[PDB]
Design a protein around this ligand. Structure first.
Ligand SMILES: OC[C@H]1O[C@@H](O)[C@H](O)[C@@H](O)[C@@H]1O
Ligand SMILES: OC[C@H]1O[C@@H](O)[C@H](O)[C@@H](O)[C@@H]1O
Ligand SMILES: OC[C@H]1O[C@@H](O)[C@H](O)[C@@H](O)[C@@H]1O
Ligand SMILES: OC[C@H]1O[C@@H](O)[C@H](O)[C@@H](O)[C@@H]1O
Lengths: 756, 756
């Protein structure tokens, strides 16, 4: 293995425990996730070992993505004394994530108090093609000495969730078995609710010139830590090659029967290939994905690198084979938000997959399809009809939003988002149409998508409330995307999206009846559709209230938002983020016009082909200036929409706010996990903002790019109607090339229609 | 509580993890022992939690004193984040062991990265009179803030033995059960060989003005850790009191019945007593101990204070109520030597007890008595007779000396002390007489002691070999007190002591037959003692070879020793310990005249009333120059004999070495546990060296003091034939007063009879 050039490398400065790097250096294949801890597992490190879909509640308030035993641990002892990196003089330190190859490398050259110098150089990856497999390889060289070296491998099944918060800590698993099976060591667990079993097999070997070079192997059962240990009579300057393969299998897999048998056989197979060869198979997967997803920015090396970083974590975390999971708000990179799935995925993350790997996007839509029954049950429990998707989803599709937490001031507080942040159900319907529009996947629409869109429309028809005096339908006592304002009436974003979802479902019903009558019938029989429902939906939609001041062309975020105390945003912090205005009480956010994130502007982004340029510009200007950017979701959408409305003054800096969310930790909580929505947002702002792509009413692909000052070019590729397109954007021009000649693509390049 | 004056305080300078101070501040009551870690249990700390007599082997090479779960842990959290003292600015730090009240005290004033200042102040003790009880009491003041404090009490059963050595690391217990019993938390273990069960019940509470002030208690089951948590809405300046009581019960106690029930009942009674009542009981016990054992040295503060330290640890570690344990080589203060009992106890430590609290000496000797069957089996199976006491003893009395270890160069070695360091069995018979002569405890002598002495004489008769050519009995292939020399023939120390044991045994049989013939009958039947044996002993003893090299008057350590290469000890380190001469190889110590510790000079101390002053001088002079002091048993014996031969500067020098063994860590390995022999050594150097005491034939207490230049005054007390004698030595004068009268006392002060 050879490192990629610097352009592809993300570097940690200093040898130390770091929450931030544990997140940025977290490695996943969309099934296994592993936090970027150091292999020694130092004192203050937070390990993270996750398998997608493996959730457990036990004594916690809601179900949580399980922190499984930590299997990657590896220590070196010199004559039975732990070679402790933080205890040595550091002669050489390098530590990098290689985004092109998807490996985490680390090289240490250490001088201990005895003046002995040792080299430890190696890497690890979570296999993209062997989803069960983790691979670690480290060369060790005793440069000026000879000694007995103990290579210690260990699985640590003392891990817990919420390790730093005494109230919330819980161990979500019990240890079923531990075994020295000669060829390695095994530890198996069952989650405490008993819904999942996981096996972990690990096998370490120490070689010199590809022979096993250890005089003794022993194993230790230390309670809930099991170890595998190789003693080597190490001679000065010789190259001791340590390889550790670890396999994780869960009872989610078809169909395994015994995780122990499956683990250990899987490990046998992996043993017949070399570390070199598992690596090459791993790197091929990254080639295939980068070939489409890579974006080249010329003139801004910070932007270019930060964008590779965003994309890499996006391409790493999705598994199109798994139609029973989707992407948590922090990927598989940490515990913040408990591995739950929000609108972050449908609205921020999904378009990336729609346009770069449509099979991933479909799988994540199949997650929602498969939880339709839980969404129907969720509706029924709240007095509504159709499908009411939860604000926070895990494995069953029940509402997993906590009811209690702590506010900005550390006080206990009720959490209302699960209860009344309803827009999620519309967001999923929108994301369904977005996927089908892009791919022309009619099969999906007919068999799965239509049912989702119609059931969420049924939900919206149940919650809309007719106000007779006013001759309008309202949706009252909600939270819109701006979570600062709770118990609002007629959030415009919510009302509009509901209105969109209702008209979409009618339109679909009449299309399926006219054009796909056998599919219409099967849907109608499955979900009990009546002939009147399409009309009922048209009628509610025609009269849903949108708060709107025609004289000022301003869309009011929710009724009465205009009477609330205004406030000037006067300064930015070291990371160029808004700082709260003087006067503001952080538990009275409801009384001001300050907003957390894009809300009307989010609406203007999603349903933009239905508002005029003046409107978009006017509402952009009003809200952008009142936006605190207090969610990692916020800046991407203001970069993207800034461009779209000619208000490019601040487009660059919002863009760099999203792109550096975790690399500069600009929200201060990167240690909780990757800000997964902001990754998708960054990609969207380049392609739908700077790259100037927008979709028009007749599904014609319009292109009106704007590059910031520093950028001479921007290249990116998207899938559009089954055609792979290459865009090259420069200061002056736009070129679009099809990668396969054949098929017709209609574009509107700066007001001018063009065929390719 | 109020701290004692500074003369009675041992101070740590700096807040940190420290093996040295874990040992130095280990607290014990002779049942429980607890290493001097900080409440929080920082990452580099080495907990030790032991119960006397609780030993397990499992996968280890030999049985080891078990490191049980660590029950003392206590951490504070402010709004859910750990107040970690190592992460704060330390505005104030004080940590002392109070030798007089036997409590460990710490005060911190901490300033965190958020600017909040917190004070944490308190202490802990392992109850001297309630042998199952650990008491902890801390005050917390939030000096410039208010917040929610979480007080977390934890029992950590993830502990193991030999934690920092991978080959040797062994968890010696399984967790039987954990329970939240509302007024506390419970964890029970059973050791892996199943020989001991232990219950731990702990109760924490948080009070403001002696009223429970927490709004919530909760407990957590985190695998092999259980926690008890208290949430407090803490207000600036208020003093919150945390009290933690912990009960440890083992199946070594009588009538435990159900362990959970016994533990939680005991803690319930203790909970009826205030901490101040509990502390006053505890201090009263130390008061009773110090009233006899305190030694007052004037003119030298370093020596007066380190002496308090040495006696503190001795008085803390003996439980005269327990006749089935004795003192391990490192007390109950660490895992060094695995809790094994060696000649250290009978010869070094036991005299301190014999003269300051004989009841403790007698229990220690009953430990031996109760292990005679094992000593008989040990003899038998080695092809010998009588009672061959093991070199290292634990619970069963079988030989527990490891056969394999690592030499001075780090390489695997055969350890031969268990096989051929035979002198332990005479050492025990010596200790018996020593104890009996001081106390006139005839009953012990008739019922217990005589059986020991006679069965060890039987051993010595059975190992002696007749050399027909040279006309004498020999004991060949031995290790004597100087362990640098292995497979020696006729070690003088061993031959004389065997000769002493044989003759003592004949003598006792003659006394028993004549003065107590019923007892002589009962013992003779018990052990099948025939009429002829005592004549056999007398006969073997008359012909045992003693390497005199007259009339040089020079006792050769063993035969051939004088032919080995001589080296000059020339250099010393900054603690004044001998450094190896140049040209010495540490794997060839058998070929040199360098010795580890007192051997011939050990013999001149123990059987002093049998060699003349000229003889002593000569041998002291020859051997001291050759003594490396590579055992902490070495310096005290040379101080003592030094004074006895008027070689007197080197006496003070050796004395300060044994005084400071742990406080200056002069052997470099204080972190393993207290050097328990050296404690006794120090005491004996004072009383029998500088103090001038010896016992000459016919139990005449003789006194010929020599105080060092610095010393104006030396006071101390001893029990002699049931009399408590207070002694006061000044450079010119000696006085003696009875504080308790009993036996008649035959006293000589500088050749002259005296009265009292
Ligand atoms: O998980 C509980 C809640 O936490 C808040 O920090 C987020 O803003 C909500 O969207 C979420 O529902
Ligand atoms: O990322 C999870 C949630 O975090 C909150 O801070 C945002 O307000 C929500 O819109 C978001 O979905
Ligand atoms: O415990 C094994 C051996 O260790 C050595 O350090 C000691 O010198 C012996 O007296 C003991 O038997
Ligand atoms: O302290 C236990 C043992 O340690 C060894 O180093 C000494 O040489 C022995 O005499 C001693 O009994």
């Amino acid at each position: 293995m050879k490192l990629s050039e610097r352009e592809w490398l993300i570097e940690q400065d200093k040898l130390e425990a770091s929450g931030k790097f544990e997140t940025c250096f977290a490695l996943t294949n969309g099934y296994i996730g592993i936090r970027g801890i150091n292999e020694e597992v130092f004192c203050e490190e937070t390990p993270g070992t996750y398998i997608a879909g493996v959730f457990d509640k036990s004594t916690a308030q809601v179900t949580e993505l399980v922190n499984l035993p930590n299997p990657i641990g590896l220590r070196i002892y010199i004559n039975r004394e732990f070679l402790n990196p933080l205890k040595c003089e550091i002669l050489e330190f390098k530590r990098v994530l290689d985004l092109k190859q998807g490996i985490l490398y680390r090289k240490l050259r250490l001088k201990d108090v005895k003046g002995r110098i040792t080299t430890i150089e190696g890497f690890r990856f979570v296999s993209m093609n062997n989803k069960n497999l983790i691979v670690q390889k480290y060369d060790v060289v005793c440069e000026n000495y000879s000694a007995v070296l103990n290579v210690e491998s260990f699985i640590d099944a003392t891990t817990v969730n919420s390790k730093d918060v005494p109230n919330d800590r819980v161990k979500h698993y019990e240890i079923d078995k531990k075994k020295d099976f000669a060829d390695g060591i095994y530890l198996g667990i069952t989650t405490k609710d008993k819904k999942y079993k996981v096996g972990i097999a690990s096998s370490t070997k120490v070689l010199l010139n590809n022979q096993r070079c250890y005089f003794n192997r022993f194993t230790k059962d230390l309670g809930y830590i099991i170890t595998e240990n190789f003693e080597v009579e190490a001679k000065q300057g010789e190259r001791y090659e340590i390889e550790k393969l670890t396999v994780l299998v869960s009872s989610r897999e078809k169909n395994v029967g015994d995780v122990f048998e499956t683990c250990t056989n899987k490990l046998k197979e992996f043993e017949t290939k070399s570390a070199e060869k598992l690596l090459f198979e791993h790197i091929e997967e990254y080639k295939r994905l980068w070939d489409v997803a890579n974006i080249d920015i010329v003139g801004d090396e910070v932007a270019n690198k930060s964008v590779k970083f965003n994309i890499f974590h996006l391409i790493s975390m999705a598994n199109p084979e798994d139609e029973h999971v989707s992407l948590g708000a922090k990927g598989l990179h940490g515990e913040g938000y408990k591995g739950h799935v929000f609108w972050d995925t449908e609205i921020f993350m999904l378009p990336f997959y729609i346009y770069t790997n449509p099979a991933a996007a479909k799988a994540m839509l199949m997650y929602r399809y498969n939880l339709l029954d839980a969404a129907r049950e969720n509706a029924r429990k709240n007095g509504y009809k159709g499908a009411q998707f939860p604000w926070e989803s895990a494995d069953t599709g029940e509402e997993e939003t906590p009811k209690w937490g702590y506010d900005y001031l550390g006080n206990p507080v009720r959490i209302w988002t699960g209860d009344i942040e309803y827009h999620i159900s519309a967001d999923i319907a929108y994301a369904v149409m977005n996927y089908v529009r892009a791919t022309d996947d009619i099969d999906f629409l007919l068999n799965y998508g239509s049912e989702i869109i119609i059931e969420t429309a049924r939900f919206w028809a149940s919650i809309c409330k007719y106000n007779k005096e006013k001759g309008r339908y309202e949706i009252n006592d909600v939270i819109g995307p701006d979570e600062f304002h709770e118990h609002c009436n007629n959030n415009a974003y919510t009302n509009y999206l509901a209105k969109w979802n209702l008209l979409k479902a009618s339109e679909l019903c009449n299309l399926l009846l006219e054009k796909y009558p056998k599919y219409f019938e099967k849907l109608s029989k499955k979900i009990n559709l009546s002939d009147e429902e399409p009309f009922v939906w048209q009628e509610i939609a025609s009269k849903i209230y949108i708060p709107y001041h025609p004289d000022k062309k301003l869309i009011e975020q929710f009724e009465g938002y205009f009477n609330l105390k205004d406030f000037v945003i006067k300064e930015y912090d070291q990371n160029n983020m808004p700082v709260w205005p003087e006067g503001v009480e952080l538990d009275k956010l409801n009384n001001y016009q300050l907003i957390k994130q894009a809300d009307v502007v989010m609406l203007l982004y999603l349903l933009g082909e239905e508002f005029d340029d003046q409107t978009k510009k006017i509402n952009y200007d009003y809200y952008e200036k009142r936006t605190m950017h207090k969610s990692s979701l916020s800046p991407s959408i203001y970069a993207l929409m800034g461009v779209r409305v000619g208000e490019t003054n601040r487009a660059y800096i919002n863009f760099m706010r999203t792109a550096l969310t975790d690399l500069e930790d600009n929200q201060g909580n990167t240690h909780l996990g990757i800000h997964a929505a902001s990754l998708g947002g960054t990609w969207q702002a380049l392609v739908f903002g700077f790259g100037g792509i927008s979709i028009e009413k007749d599904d014609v692909l319009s292109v009106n790019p704007w590059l910031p000052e520093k950028w001479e070019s921007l290249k990116f590729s998207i899938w559009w109607k089954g055609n792979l397109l290459d865009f090259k954007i420069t200061k002056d021009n736009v070129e679009v090339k099809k990668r396969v000649e054949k098929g017709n693509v209609k574009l509107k390049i700066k007001g001018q229609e063009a065929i390719i």
